[PDB]
Structure formats: C-alpha cells, structure tokens
C-alpha cells in the first residue's frame, strides 16, 4: 500500500538520525502499521541472511526488538512470530557475537509466543517500580548536569524529564488495560474497563495487577505455548469475573485496537559542577540486579575524559569496597552535550543516533536510554608513582602526561602483536617528557625536550636523578600536578560500564 510503501521507504532511509523518531511516530498512528512494519523487516532481514553482510544485522535487531515490544495486540491468525523464529533459527552458524544477539531474540520470541505482553509488563513494572513480591525489582534515572557546560535546551529537557507526571494508580490502569487488550484482541471495550477501574481503589488495583502479572509469568513458564495462550486467556477471564468486570471483556463485536505508548519512568536531576562523581554516593545516604542506577552523564569531550577519570576512580573504589553494587547494578550512559567518537567509529548506529546530538530530543533520549544494551570498554593506562619519601601511589590516566617544567632514566619495552618484548634503555638528560596518545591496543608516543624527537612506547619506567622530585601532570590537567616523584611506571591495564548500542 502507499502507506506501507512509505513505511518501507522510511525504514530504508533509516538503515543507511531523526529517521528513527519519524518512523516511530509514523508507526504509532495505527496498530496495523506494526504488523506491516514487522513484515518488511523479516523480508529485508532474510535478504542479509543470504548476502552475508554483517553490518546491517545489529541495527535491524534493535528495530525488531523495539517494534514487537510496542505493538498492542497480535491476532492469533497472524503467524509473523513463526516467520521470525524460523528466520532467526538459522543464524546460529554465524560468528560471535551476532549469535549472541540472535540467541537473545530467540529467547524473547519464545517468551512472547507463550504469553503475549510479558515483555511490556516487565519493562513498565521495572520502570515504575510497582513490582510484585515474588518479583521485586525497580529502576532509577539520574541526570547529572553542569549548568554552565550543559546548554539551556538540555537543562529544559532534564527539568521536563524530572517532572513527576504519572501516578501509581495510572500505572496500574495502563498496565491492566494493556495486558487485557493484548491478550483479548479487540473483543474488549477498553473504555468500559477504564471507567470501572477509575472507581477502583489503589489496594484492589494493585492486588489484581499482581495476580495478573503472576498469571502472566506462570503462562510464560508453561511448555506448550499453544495451550499456554488459551490457558492464560481463560485465567484472565476468570480474574475479570472474580473482580466484577468480565462484561467489558470478550465482547463478540471487536472494538478499535489502540496503541499504548510506553509510560515515563521516574527521573531525578542533580547539578554536577564538580567532575568528581562522589556526588552520587551522597544520594545513596539520601539488590544489585533488582534495579539499576541509569546515570545519565551529559557529554562534553574536554570534560568527557576528565570525568571518565572520576568514573574509573570510583570504579576502583567500589571494586575494592563494593557497596554501591549492593544497591544497584549500576549502568552509565554518556550523552554528547572524544569518548563518543570512539563509540561511533566502532558502532556506526551510535555515531548516527547518539552522537548527532514530548520533544523529539526527549523521545530520542528515552529511546536510546532504553534500548542501548551493550557495554563497551575503553583503553586506559595505569601507572605507579613513587615519591621522594618512599610514598607509592597508583593512578590511571587515558589522555596524556607531562613530566618536567635532568638526568632522566628512561626504560621502555616496545612490543609486537606477535609478542616480542623488545626492551630498551635510553638514560638521557631531558627536560619535558610529554606522553602523546598516538592513534589491539596502541602506543603512546613519548616525547622529550632535549634536536627534538618523539617515539612510541608500550610499557615504560622512568627513574629520577637520585631521588630528584619531578612534577608530573595527569591528562593535561594543570589542577592535579603531582610532584615530589622519583619513579614512574606506566603500562596498559585491563557492573558499571560505558553502556553503548555496540
């Protein structure tokens, strides 16, 4: 159809920015679009399954895992899930990690077939935190901003997101309406059920919601999905009867299926003038897997790295004194306001959606925060500094170093990918020892001010002139300039990661 053709065109234009948001809006107008869209993907997906072009695989996956998670109802006549299952069941011959993506999708598809709507209910229940006793889990959203660095538009976005729009009563209303719609198709009058619920108290609503979620999970646990679906449909009919509103359901005449946009999760905003993340630890006073602290750091290069320093710092602090994990299995999300550039070069999807940066920006932010689910690590260079008085300290840096404004003992072990530790000693009198991050790891190009010259290194040691104190910088930071240093070792070292789409 013309609308279907436009859907395909928009999807194609996306594959090659705001295309994602535009597509989301377009599909959100009619429930039918969903199925239509899901068809086109399984067409294009199959294409790659033969052409063996790896790159396009990762984006489509997300789109699919997005589209299915938003559709309101799947008529039992529709078999599109079987088509997806068969299409993805033949990817296991693919290399790693694509097989991981396909395995996760297979698990998700089995879940959906057994008991539709499970994924939506789980996501919303975790987001709003109205979790059941058997499955007690929650979610958080923290927006750390530097008012000056973060532009006024970003500030408006954060303020809007921290706005407490919804209420738990509305959460129960939406969750029950969505579950019944998805399960019973159009044979229910959502208006009548909504009217009956609006009179119902919070306690009874929550009890019914908990029971419905328990029935959902139980059905998802059943072996045969075909029988499980009917079993759960009957159970929900019995639940509606017992509560006292069965009439709205099962209506012989179908209604008009309604799209249910995902709700808005809790959000709290804090100023973060400091580049030290410790601010968060304070809010702690104010289970790891039961919830996560989706810290949302606004991203500026200059400070990007200087704050990454803080991140890694507290990373070590908790790795040695794990307490934050006991509360939340943390997750971090950078937000360009070159830690992004690296992500984009590795994962182009990120480069085209996150790096490009309710209002369009807010929707994009929500989407990104909710679907980017692939932690990526960054390379980093550990070092140990021994001072005049025998004091020894361990530091970690990623940008560069500056040692000087002397008879510097300079030893270094260049390396080969093959693994040839070509040691070398250059005990030369130098003044300014500037480490440059030239760019499978890499080699900082050590610099020296004697006739100048600069060369790469892999693992280095510098010894001063008979306990000579030499100033050392940290990633160009003129604030933290350690001194009284006599010895300096440098070498590359290897839940709270740098969340990326990957």
């Amino acid at each position: 159809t013309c609308t279907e053709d436009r859907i395909q065109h928009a999807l194609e234009r996306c594959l090659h920015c705001l295309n994602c948001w535009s597509l989301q809006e377009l599909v959100s107008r009619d429930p039918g679009h969903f199925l239509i869209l899901l068809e086109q993907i399984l067409q294009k997906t199959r294409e790659v399954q033969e052409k063996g072009t790896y790159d396009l695989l990762a984006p489509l996956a997300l789109l699919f895992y997005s589209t299915v998670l938003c559709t309101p109802h799947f008529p039992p006549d529709s078999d599109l899930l079987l088509k997806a299952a068969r299409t993805y069941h033949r990817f296991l011959t693919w290399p790693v990690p694509y097989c991981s993506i396909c395995q996760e999708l297979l698990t998700f598809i089995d879940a959906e077939l057994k008991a539709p709507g499970i994924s939506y209910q789980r996501l919303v229940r975790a987001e709003q935190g109205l979790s059941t006793r058997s499955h007690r889990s929650s979610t958080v959203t923290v927006l750390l901003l530097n008012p000056v660095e973060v532009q006024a538009e970003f500030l408006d976005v954060a303020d809007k997101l921290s706005t407490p729009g919804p209420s738990p009563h509305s959460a129960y209303i939406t969750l029950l309406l969505h579950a019944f719609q998805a399960t019973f198709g159009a044979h229910c009058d959502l208006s009548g059920l909504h009217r009956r619920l609006q009179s119902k108290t919070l306690a009874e609503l929550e009890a019914i919601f908990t029971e419905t979620a328990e029935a959902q999970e139980l059905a998802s646990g059943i072996g045969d999905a075909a029988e499980a679906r009917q079993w759960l449909r009957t159970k929900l009919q019995a639940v509606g009867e017992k509560a006292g509103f069965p009439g709205v359901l099962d209506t012989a005449k179908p209604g008009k299926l309604r799209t249910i946009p995902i709700p808005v999760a809790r959000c709290y905003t804090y100023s973060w003038n400091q580049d030290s993340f410790d601010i968060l630890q304070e809010i702690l006073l104010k289970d790891p897997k039961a919830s996560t602290l989706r810290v949302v750091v606004f991203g500026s290069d200059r400070i990007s790295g200087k704050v990454a320093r803080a991140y890694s710092n507290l990373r070590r602090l908790e790795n040695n004194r794990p307490l934050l994990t006991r509360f939340f299995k943390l997750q971090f999300f950078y937000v360009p306001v070159d830690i992004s550039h690296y992500l984009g070069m590795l994962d182009p999807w990120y480069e085209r959606n996150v790096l490009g940066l309710l209002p369009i920006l807010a929707d994009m932010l929500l989407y990104y925060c909710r679907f980017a689910a692939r932690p990526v690590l960054l390379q980093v260079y550990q070092t140990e500094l021994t001072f005049i008085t025998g004091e020894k300290t361990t530091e970690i840096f990623i940008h560069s170093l500056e040692l000087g404004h002397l008879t510097l003992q300079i030893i270094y072990s260049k390396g080969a990918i093959s693994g040839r530790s070509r040691w070398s000693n250059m005990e030369k009198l130098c003044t300014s020892v500037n480490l440059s991050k030239a760019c499978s790891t890499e080699a900082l190009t050590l610099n020296l001010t004697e006739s100048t010259s600069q060369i790469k290194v892999d693992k280095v040691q510098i010894i001063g002139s008979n306990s000579c104190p030499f100033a050392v910088c940290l990633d160009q930071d003129e604030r933290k300039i350690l001194q009284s240093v006599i010895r300096c070792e440098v070498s590359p070292c290897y839940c709270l990661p740098i969340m990326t789409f990957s």
Binding site: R90, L92, T93, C99, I417, S418, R422
Partner: protein
C-alpha cells in the same frame, strides 16, 4: 538422560554414585557433574575438595582391559562403553575413578633411554599449538599390543630369510638333477651331504641324523640332546635356515649359488626367545572411537530447538570463509633495500590451489600491521578434510618468496579451527617441493619471522559429519566415446588431463570403475570443491569389488599414495592393497614408503600403522626401518616430530635384545663420528693422531660387538688399529677395518667401512634403492647384468657409513699409474691392468665377460636416471673385472649420455669404428635389458618423480620429469626404442675423451 554409576576411591568399601547425564552431553560436563555430586555424597568430602577433578582418570573395563575416557570434548554418545554395555545388558554404568600417579623412576629412566636412542626428545611440548602428537602417541598403543600378541617368538628370534619367486632360468643351470651339496661344519669336522633342492631344513637334519646316528661321537653331539636342539646357521653370519620352505627359497642359498661358492652351515642351538620380552605396557588403552563424530542427520540443527543444540554440522553453514590477518613482525631485517611486501593467502587441497587472495603491499619494515579481512569465494560447507591454509610473505620489488607456513583448516578430530593464532614461518632454502606441505611451525621461536591471524569463533564447535554411504541406485556408451576414453586412460601417468576428459570420466565413472588401471586418473578429475561431489565419490568407492579382485600391482598402488590424493579412503584402499605384500618386496620398497609417509596430511594414517605392523612382525625390516627413520629425525626439521612419534611407538615393542643392539650400534657410531669431526677440523701427524684416538677409544667403552648397520647378520668385532687410515679427499673420509666377532668365520677377511662426513648421502641411498629395484626387475626378466649394489646409509647430519668393496680401484688412479697428471687417456692401460691382475686366461675371459655385463647395466641405469654424465674420477673397478660407480651425492654445454670412454672400446677390442663379437654381445644384452626395463615405464616414472619430490631440497620443476619421460621413449614401437638407444650408443662412441677431458680441466681449475 543416562543413569551411570561411578566407583569412588574412598572406601569401609569403595563408594558409588549413580548419575544421570545429558544424552548428548560431553565428557567435560559429565566430569563437572560427577565432581559436584561427589562433593555432596562423599563420606570424606574433604578428600575430593583438596583435589580438582583433573587429578583423577576414568578407567572402565571392557572384557578385562581398562580403557580410559581420554577426549574431554567428545560427546558421551559416541563412547563405545555405552554400546558394549547395551550388548552386555549392563546398567547403570560403571566407571572406576583413579587418582593420577606420578610415573615411576623406572619409567622415567626407560623414557630417557628411548629419548637417547631416538636422538631427540619426544616428550617435549614446546613447538606445538595443539594436542595431535600426544593424542597419536596414545592412539598407537593398541596396534602394538595386537601385533605383539600374534607373533611366534621362535621364528621371530631366528628371523629366517626366504622368498617365493621362481628360480631365474640362468640359475637353474647351476642346480642339476634337483640336488646340491651342503657342507656341515661341526666342532672340528666337515661333512658334505647331497640334498635335493626341495628338502626343508627339518627333513635334511633328520636325514643327516639318521645317517650319522651311529657316529654321533665324532660329530660331538650329546646323546641326550637330540636333533630337536640343533638347527642350521650360516657360518660366519647371524642368519638362520629354519621354517618350512624349499631349500632354494632362502635368499642366502640363492646368493651363494650366484657366487659359485660351496654352501657352508653349522649346527647350533636355537636362540633364546626369552630375550625378546617386551616391558609390560604402562598405559591404559585409549577408547575405541575418537575420530568419528556422527552422521549429518544428528549433527544438524534444523528440526531442533536451539536450547537442545549441542553442535552444528559444518555442512549446514553456507557463508564465505573469512580470515583476519593482523601483522608480521621480525627481529632484524633480512636485507637493506626498500621493497614492498604483501602477504598472500591461499586455500589448497593436495597440490591444487582451490583459491587465492592477496593483501596490500606496504613499505617493508621489521613490523608491519594490517588488521585486514580476507574472504574467499569458497563457502564454508565446501571445505574438504585436510585442506591447507597456505600463507606466504611476498616481498615485491615479480615478488620474491621469503617465508611461508601451512595450517590445517580442520584439525584431527573434525573441529573447525577457531580463535587466535601466532605462527612461526619457515624460510626458503623451481616449482614445488615436499617441504611446503609441512604442518609444523619453526622451532626457533626466538628469531623466526612470526605472523598473527584470527578466525572467528562460534558459540558451539562446528564439527564435520561422517558420510552415510547409503547405496546409490544410479547405460551402454557409444563405441567411439569408449575408444576415446580408453585412449585417454592409456596415456602415461604424467600426461595432463584436460577439463573435457575429467568431465567425461566423472560422467562415465561407472565405466572406469570396471577397470583397476583407471583409478589414479579417475580421482584427479574429481572436483574437490563441492560437498555433493564428495558424497557421490564416497558412494562410488563403497562398491569396491573390482579393486579388491584386482591383482596386486605395486606400481599402480604407488601412484595412489602420491601427494595428488589427500582423501581418507583413497589412501585407505591403497594401504589395503599393500597389506598383501610379502616381506622381500617390502624390503625393496621400504625407503620409498617411508618417504611417502611425509605426504600424509595428518600424523596418524593407515600408512603409519601398516609400517608399524610390518616392522613389529619381523626383525630385519625392523632394523632397516629404525635406521631410515633415525636418519629422517636428525635432518628434516620439518617432520622430525612425526617420525619421532612413530619411532617411539615402535621401540616400545621390539623387545630387549633388539634394544641392547640399538644401544651398542648408536654408541659406536656416535664415538666414531665425534672423532671424525675432531680430526677433519684440521700429514703424518693426522694419521698418528687418528691412531692414537682409536687407541684411546679402545681404552674408552667402545663396545666390542655390534651388528653392522646395513647388514644385520654381520657382527663386527674389535678394530684392527693398524689397518686403519685416512683417505686423501677434499672431505677426507676415514677408512676403518674391523674384524668379525664370530669364532666360526671361515675366512679372516676384514670388515671394511668408510666413514664420511660433511655430505648428505640420502640422494645416494635413494639411487641405490632404485638400482636394487631395477636389478629385481631384470632378475624377474631372467637375465644377469651383474650390477653391484653396496650398502650405503646415513645416520645423522652429514655423516655416513659406506661398505667397502674389497679389491677395488678407481679408474682415475689406473690412469695416473701410467699417464700420471697430464690428461692423455691411453686405452691399453685398463686392459693391461686387468690382464696383469688375471694371469690365467680363463680368468681373463670371465673377467672380460663380467666387465661387459656390468658396463651395460650401469650405462642403461645411468641413462634412464639421466645422471650418466659422470666424471672419469668416480668410477671403481674390481680385480674380478667387475665395474661400478660411487659418490652419487653431487650428481643430482655438450651433455654426453653416459660414460663409454674409448678405453672401454679397447677392452672390448673394437677400437675405432670397427666391430667384433664382444661389441655385438654388449649391444644385444643392452637392448634386451633396455626393452625388458621399458616394460615397466609406469613404475619407473612414479618412483623417479617421488624421488625428485622428496629428494633434493631445492624446488623442482616439471622439466626433470619431462626429461625422464622423453628418455624411455614412452609410447613408441620396439624398433623405435632400439634405434633410439643405438643412436645414444653411437653418440657416446663418437665424442671420445673430449667431455671427460673438459671435466678434468674444470675440476683442476
């Protein structure tokens, strides 16, 4: 699941634990389950907490024999224990668990002894990135025990030598009235008895006892000890005459008759079988099936839920094979010159390059990092077993080839290689050589150019199926096509096959299958790049009645083992055919088979096991096998590990006495080699120092007895210090002269040896094998060329032992005797020397006849092998008029065919262009031999090609094989060959001394 019970070390009685295991679970998962259950069930759980699961092995009995569940990644289903129990209706399973145990000090001492004998440690695991060698070592255990069980200690110890071919006609002249005289030396008596050619040793001994039953006293045979306790033995040598075979069927008797020498034998008690014990095996047998993965039905995924997927059949995958090349690093440059260097990768099956790809050239340096992906057009499902992923580093300005390295895409146990890899690349020393197929890495991991690659892993192993040869149901051909096809089949082995012919053969392959000779040509046409064709071919080979009924043809079977064919079943049927060969033919072809072992893609084959069995079943073959392999280990760094494994798997079953003999021989050779190296490093001083050193060696532990390498029946004794000396040569060999340690030796002749250093002999060893094969052919043709093979051998890097032809002088010396050092070559010199050495005219005539024979034989052989351009300073002649060559080590723009100097013409008397009876006899014999030989063009060509491939180190090109073909005059009438050979003879006659004189000048220069 699978209910299985595991016995447990801890007792008051050994504990048991019944367990259910995944039907398709592997051994690792089962081990984890067993350890976890034991941690709970254990009466003393601390005992099992202290140790890990790896500190125990799983031994289960099968009819009484413990087998160990070795392969930790094999699937539980393939285990033969389950199948055997089902046959036995034993359940739930019973698997004893035994903690590891450190090897006994005795075991360590024995292991070090074997390492010393081999000359290279086998237990090392340094230059390896796999487990194939240890796995093969454990695998080979079963054949050793099986063969040892079925061996008669008596005959095994006596190891009589026999054969079964008909007597050559000329030799039937010597035997008359079907009887011959045998001399018996006993104590101090010599009695001659006439016995028919068809009287076995037992019958002859019984008849002799009956004759002399009244006179045992003089014979000095105790009355108690009856005939049972005495058997014949050849006087002066350790070779017996026992068994049940006509007296003419023992090689020694035929040799004596050929030599015209009265047969002498002496009674002696049987050698003790107890000396042949083998140390009780120190290992449990490894399970039966390890190299079988299953049928494609089970290993595929379609029709299975992903949660129930244990493995992915390789054929299911259908992408393009893809690899990632990271970089190349070398410590120091190879040269100082700006040259672009690019890596080139290829996929090769056999010698056929399935596909190629090349990278980007870059300014060469010590380090060059690419990190680039290469995708071959070939899909993953069409990877045949044994494919080689060749890698090369072409240094451009064509681009020189600097290094390379091979790699098996599929490892031994049928699991696609996956993960990271760091290889060490060999360095180059034509078109092809046997070196490029080495699967090993460079031991010098310090200063050897190394490369790094990456192959994408998978969430599961990608195994390979095993074919399910379900019968194939798959009329008459046009007669013209039949004629064309047959003509194609009739071409020479080397004749290339066009695409059209290949398609025809494959299309009409059921036609060819009805003809054995077509087999080698039929498999070349097969396209290896498709799974479907492979399946069809295996179906074709399933029906193998025609090949089986085919009479054994060694020449044909050799063609199969060439590198062309890397199929599992092709070489299996070839070995099957070889299984029928008797012992003597094996002695003939042993060196060529050992060479062919190189081409086998994997460490364990059918060929290796066949060799092991034949060696263990006999002594003599075992001896020669030992020396050949030991020579291979020392030299060829490419394959030292494989031969080391095979030889170790051997030496553990030979026995005791054999081990002691190897010990003594190796010690003596090492001492002499050390002295030789010390001496050659630097006049009469040299001789005095050598004699002093020999005296010291006597003062040292230079054993007094040892079987000579190239002649096990001959026991060397104590050196004759005075008779030794140093020859005058650019390499200065040593001249040793031992004396036999047998007190019963008839004569006092010494045992000569020449000990050469600083030169490889393998070329000479191979050429001598070729000459022996040719001699066998001619004997089958009922002639006598009186060729002179002598036993040469190599026993290390540039060290060799050579038999000494007694009473033998080079032709150059004879020339110097009269002419001196000018260059003139009078023809009367050789005749005068021979006549002087032969005062009796009858002796003179016999010597002339033998001289003509040997000259003809050697001329033919050298011409056939195309090495007849021998300088006039490498040919020897015996006082008996016999002639022969030596020094086949340097020979591997006029080009004379072969040396037929005019002096030979004078010897035969027909100087100039005149002729006489002698010359015509020479020509007649030459032509007879030449045609009889051309009757085996296939065998000659295949052996020569194998020699070139696995012989000289430098790269070889088809030009050599082109020449060889040309020479024999393949596919030409008998008269054409006669004319061609006579033309060669006349060309040799015409030139005269010109070429040899030029050679003399060049050597002087």
């Amino acid at each position: 699941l699978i209910p299985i019970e595991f016995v447990l070390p801890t007792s008051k009685t050994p504990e048991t634990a019944l367990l259910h295991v995944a039907g398709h679970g592997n051994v690792e998962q089962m081990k984890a389950q067993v350890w976890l259950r034991a941690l709970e069930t254990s009466v003393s759980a601390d005992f099992y907490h202290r140790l890990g699961p790896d500190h125990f092995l799983l031994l289960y009995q099968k009819k009484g024999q413990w087998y160990e569940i070795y392969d930790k990644y094999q699937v539980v289903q393939t285990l033969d224990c389950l199948r055997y129990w089902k046959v036995l209706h034993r359940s739930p399973g019973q698997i004893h668990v035994v903690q590891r145990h450190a090897p006994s000090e005795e075991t360590l001492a024995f292991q070090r002894q074997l390492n010393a004998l081999i000359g290279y440690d086998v237990t090392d695991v340094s230059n390896v990135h796999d487990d194939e060698l240890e796995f093969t070592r454990r695998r080979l255990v079963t054949p050793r025990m099986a063969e040892v069980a079925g061996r008669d200690p008596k005959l095994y110890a006596m190891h009589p030598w026999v054969t079964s071919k008909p007597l050559p006609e000329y030799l039937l002249k010597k035997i008359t009235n079907n009887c011959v005289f045998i001399v018996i030396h006993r104590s101090t008596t010599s009695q001659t008895i006439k016995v028919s050619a068809d009287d076995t040793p037992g019958t002859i001994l019984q008849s002799f006892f009956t004759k002399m039953a009244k006179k045992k006293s003089l014979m000095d045979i105790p009355e108690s000890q009856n005939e049972r306790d005495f058997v014949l033995r050849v006087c002066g040598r350790d070779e017996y005459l026992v068994g049940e075979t006509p007296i003419k069927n023992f090689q020694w008797v035929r040799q004596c008759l050929k030599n015209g020498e009265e047969i002498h034998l002496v009674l002696d008690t049987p050698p003790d079988p107890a000396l042949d014990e083998v140390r009780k095996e120190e290992w449990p047998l490894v399970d039966d099936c390890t190299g079988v993965t299953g049928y494609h039905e089970q290993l595929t995924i379609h029709g299975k839920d992903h949660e129930s997927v244990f493995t992915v059949s390789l054929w299911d995958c259908d992408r393009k094979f893809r690899v990632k090349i990271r970089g190349i690093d070398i410590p120091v440059l190879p040269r100082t010159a700006d040259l672009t260097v690019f890596v080139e990768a290829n996929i090769q099956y056999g010698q056929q390059v399935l596909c190629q790809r090349r990278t980007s050239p870059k300014p060469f340096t010590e380090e060059v990092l690419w990190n680039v992906w290469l995708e071959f057009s070939i899909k993953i499902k069409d990877l045949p077993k044994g494919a080689l992923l060749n890698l090369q580093i072409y240094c451009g300005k064509k681009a020189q080839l600097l290094y390379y390295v091979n790699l098996l895409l599929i490892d031994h146990r049928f699991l696609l290689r996956h993960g990271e890899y760091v290889l060490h690349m060999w360095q180059l020393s034509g078109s092809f050589n046997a070196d490029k197929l080495t699967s090993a890495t460079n031991p010098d991991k310090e200063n050897s150019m190394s490369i790094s690659i990456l192959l994408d892993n998978y969430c599961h192993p990608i195994a390979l199926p095993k074919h399910r040869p379900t019968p194939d149901p798959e009329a008459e051909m046009p007669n013209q096509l039949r004629k064309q096809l047959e003509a194609i089949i009739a071409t020479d082995p080397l004749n290339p096959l066009t695409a059209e012919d290949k398609e025809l053969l494959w299309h009409f392959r059921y036609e060819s299958l009805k003809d054995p000779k077509a087999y080698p040509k039929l498999f070349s046409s097969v396209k290896w790049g498709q799974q479907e064709i492979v399946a069809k071919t295996y179906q074709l080979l399933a029906k193998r009645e025609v090949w089986d009924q085919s009479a054994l043809d060694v020449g044909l079977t050799m063609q199969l083992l060439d590198c062309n064919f890397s199929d599992e079943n092709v070489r299996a049927i070839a070995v099957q055919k070889l299984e029928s060969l008797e012992d003597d033919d094996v002695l003939h072809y042993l060196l060529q088979l050992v060479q062919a072992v190189k081409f086998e893609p994997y460490h364990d084959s059918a060929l290796a096991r066949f060799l092991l069995k034949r060696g263990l079943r006999n002594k003599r073959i075992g001896h020669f096998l030992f020396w050949f392999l030991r020579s291979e280990i020392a030299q060829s760094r490419h394959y030292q590990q494989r031969f080391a494994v095979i030889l170790e798997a051997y030496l553990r079953g030979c026995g005791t006495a054999m081990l002691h003999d190897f010990t003594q021989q190796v010690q003596v050779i090492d001492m002499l080699q050390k002295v030789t190296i010390d001496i050659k490093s630097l006049s009469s001083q040299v001789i005095s120092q050598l004699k002093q050193k020999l005296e010291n060696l006597q003062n040292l532990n230079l054993p007094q007895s040892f079987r000579v390498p190239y002649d096990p029946g001959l026991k060397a004794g104590a050196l004759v210090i005075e008779k030794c000396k140093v020859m005058a040569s650019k390499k200065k060999p040593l001249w040793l002269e031992f004396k036999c340690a047998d007190p019963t030796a008839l004569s006092n002749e010494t045992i000569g040896i020449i000990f050469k250093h600083g030169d490889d002999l393998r070329q000479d060893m191979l050429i001598l094998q070729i000459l022996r094969i040719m001699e066998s052919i001619w004997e089958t043709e009922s002639l006598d060329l009186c060729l002179l093979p002598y036993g040469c051998i190599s026993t290390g890097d540039k060290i060799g032992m050579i038999e000494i032809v007694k009473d033998a002088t080079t032709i150059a010396k004879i020339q110097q005797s009269t002419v001196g050092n000018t260059g003139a070559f009078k023809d009367e010199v050789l005749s005068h020397w021979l006549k002087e050495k032969c005062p009796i005219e009858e002796k003179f005539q016999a010597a002339v006849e033998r001289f003509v024979y040997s000259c003809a034989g050697y001329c033919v052989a050298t011409f056939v092998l195309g090495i007849g351009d021998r300088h006039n300073d490498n040919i020897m002649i015996s006082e008996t008029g016999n002639l022969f060559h030596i020094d086949f080590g340097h020979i591997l723009k006029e080009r004379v065919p072969f040396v037929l100097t005019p002096d030979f013409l004078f010897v035969m008397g027909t100087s100039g262009k005149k002729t006489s009876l002698h010359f015509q006899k020479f020509q007649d014999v030459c032509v007879k031999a030449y045609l009889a030989l051309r009757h085996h063009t296939n065998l000659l060509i295949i052996l020569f090609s194998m020699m070139l491939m696995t012989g000289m180190p430098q790269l070889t090109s088809k030009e050599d094989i082109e020449y060889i073909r040309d020479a024999l005059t393949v596919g030409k009438s008998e008269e054409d060959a006669k004319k061609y050979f006579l033309d060669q003879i006349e060309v040799c006659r015409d030139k005269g001394w010109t070429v040899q004189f030029n050679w003399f000048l060049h050597l002087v220069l």
